[PDB]
Design a protein around this ligand. Structure first.
Ligand SMILES: Cc1cc2nc3c(=O)[nH]c(=O)nc-3n(C[C@H](O)[C@H](O)[C@H](O)COP(=O)(O)O)c2cc1C
Ligand SMILES: Cc1cc2nc3c(=O)[nH]c(=O)nc-3n(C[C@H](O)[C@H](O)[C@H](O)COP(=O)(O)O)c2cc1C
Lengths: 138, 123
């Protein structure tokens, strides 16, 4: 069991991932630093599009996936090991809530396993532990 | 499979190409159904509220909601970043995985991929 995650200096996603059972590897905040992951992982990432909309009024997802995660997933050696994605955010962004997940899910053709807010609740920790376990069992 | 499809019938035609057995949610909003076996939900996305009213009525019943193993959603990629957004909404509300997303009537790849995914889920 292995998690790859991203978290800005606000550390919300870090504090959620710290509570989970599985081992975790952090994608660096420093944009110039890169990592290489050798084993299969579930990806956990926050959303950063700012709840933008288009002139028509539909969701604008530009910047949903943090740039550091885009660089990470651009490497096919990293990308191939992704078993699924979990995304986070804040429901105050409405239809842009947690949209980094569906964006990544559709591009990689991997399931969007879960979505949560901020540092997560006790129930999120319980569900994600189970979900990650089941994914690695399968 | 449990699915919804309007008069345009795109989601219906995709589901008939799949190997698994399927049950249809009715188009008439007053008509409602009940399901007691585990199912993967497959629904299109309709904005002016991503989820069709008929699916909202279906999922509002606690007896239907408990049997969902996961959701697959569809739409049209020309809707930009509102593409297929019924799935994520349902996924988050039910706490079930969003397994796949596809366009319209689906491609050869979608048929094979959703066949594979549904088999892995039923375990
Ligand atoms: C500039 C900015 C833009 C954001 N945009 C979104 C968004 O589009 N959708 C969303 O659900 N959450 C959004 N959020 C909320 C964050 O994703 C959320 O606070 C998350 O917990 C931050 O994770 P981190 O502290 O690990 O970086 C945004 C936050 C900031 C600061
Ligand atoms: C009024 C209307 C609104 C729609 N809104 C969306 C949307 O917000 N996002 C999307 O991805 N597709 C949207 N679509 C495309 C449909 O979801 C797509 O054609 C789907 O295949 C319809 O399935 P059905 O023929 O089974 O009803 C819309 C279509 C119509 C007619």
């Amino acid at each position: 069991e292995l998690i790859v995650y991203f978290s800005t200096q606000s550390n919300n996603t870090h504090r959620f991932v710290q509570k989970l059972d599985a081992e975790s590897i952090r994608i660096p905040i420093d944009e110039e630093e890169r990592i290489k992951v050798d084993e299969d992982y579930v990806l956990i990432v926050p959303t950063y599009s700012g709840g933008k909309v288009t002139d028509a009024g539909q969701v604008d997802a530009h910047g949903a996936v943090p740039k550091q995660v885009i660089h990470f997933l651009n490497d096919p050696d990293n990308r191939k090991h992704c078993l699924g994605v979990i995304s986070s955010g804040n429901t105050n962004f409405g239809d842009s809530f947690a949209i980094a997940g569906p964006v990544i899910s559709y591009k990689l053709k991997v399931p969007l396993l879960y979505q949560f807010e901020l540092i997560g609740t006790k129930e999120d920790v319980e569900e994600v532990n189970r979900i990650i376990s089941e994914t690695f069992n399968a």
